[PDB]
Ligand binder design. Structure first.
Ligand code: MA4
Length: 265
């Protein structure tokens, strides 16, 4: 209802925590709104879209195949594996692991994919090789969600995650089918996708990947826009807040309501 920058300030003073947000134009990369855009926030399960982006880069270089089946043991599973635990005998293909990791947020799917790109260090090197010098992955699932105050491990900044997401979905760094696949995994998120579409006004496109960690950490990376087309990239991160998940979810929907009400800017 109020201007999106003034509403983002109300959410931080009502949550008693720090909020980081950036509204960027997908086609040109111009930043429309930014609050704590250069400040670090834990990435959480949102690093999985960037992780699958490095996976499609190896398939593009002929080093990987989304059809390759990976086999794992029960000892390789970590907390929260909704689909990978159901395939300990038949295994899952690299494409299926990226789908389970982004749409269902399976934590074991992300670790299994992490081992193919050279660990969190192999993924930070791909980020630096792609132009991102701030985002860094240090641990595996689920230690990277600890959200220790003052710790730069496994973090990013809203401005960096937005610029890397735009580079992966619009630069020629990824071939057309690969870019088409990464976007499809995001509009197919079965965790918050349908819940957000349920309260979005008609004609609004949405694709996303959210996250949640300790100390009230919560984040969302999304593609939004009127006329059923993804026009902007919005990245919002929440950290160091004792508020309930419902109020943290209601604060992010409140910033999203101010963005839709004052869209033209
Ligand atoms: O005048 C514009 C519109 O205003 C309302 O739409 C509401 C809507 O009723 C509401 O459900 C939603 O909640 C916002 C839900 C937030 C979900 C977004 C979550 C993330 C997505 C990616 C990052 C940004 C926020 O806001 C709008 C705008 O006020 C009307 O219902 C609607 O008829 C109308 O088209």
């Amino acid at each position: 209802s109020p201007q999106p920058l003034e509403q983002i300030k109300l959410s931080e003073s009502q949550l008693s925590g720090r909020v980081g947000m950036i509204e960027m134009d997908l086609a040109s990369g111009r930043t429309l709104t930014a609050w704590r855009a250069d400040e670090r926030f834990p990435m959480m399960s949102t690093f999985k879209v960037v992780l699958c982006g490095a996976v499609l880069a190896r398939v593009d270089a002929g080093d990987e195949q989304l059809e390759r089946k990976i086999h794992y043991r029960q000892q390789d599973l970590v907390d929260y594996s909704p689909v990978s635990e159901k395939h300990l005998a038949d295994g899952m293909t690299v494409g299926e692991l990226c789908a389970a990791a982004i749409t269902m947020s399976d934590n074991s799917a992300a670790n299994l994919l992490l081992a193919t790109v050279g660990g969190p260090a192999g993924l930070t090197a791909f980020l630096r090789q792609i132009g991102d010098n701030v985002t860094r992955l240090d641990r595996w699932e689920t230690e990277l969600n600890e959200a220790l105050p003052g710790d730069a491990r496994d973090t990013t900044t809203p401005a960096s995650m937005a610029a890397t997401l735009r580079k992966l979905l619009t630069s020629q760094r990824l071939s057309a089918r690969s870019q088409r696949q990464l976007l499809q995994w995001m509009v197919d998120d079965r965790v918050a996708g349908p819940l957000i579409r349920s309260v979005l006004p008609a004609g609004w496109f949405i694709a996303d990947k959210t996250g949640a960690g300790e100390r009230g950490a919560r984040g969302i990376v999304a593609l939004l826009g009127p006329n059923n087309k993804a026009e902007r990239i919005v990245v919002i991160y929440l950290r160091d807040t004792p508020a309930s998940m419902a109020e943290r979810n209601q604060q992010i929907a409140g910033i999203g309501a101010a963005l839709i009400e004052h869209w033209q800017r």
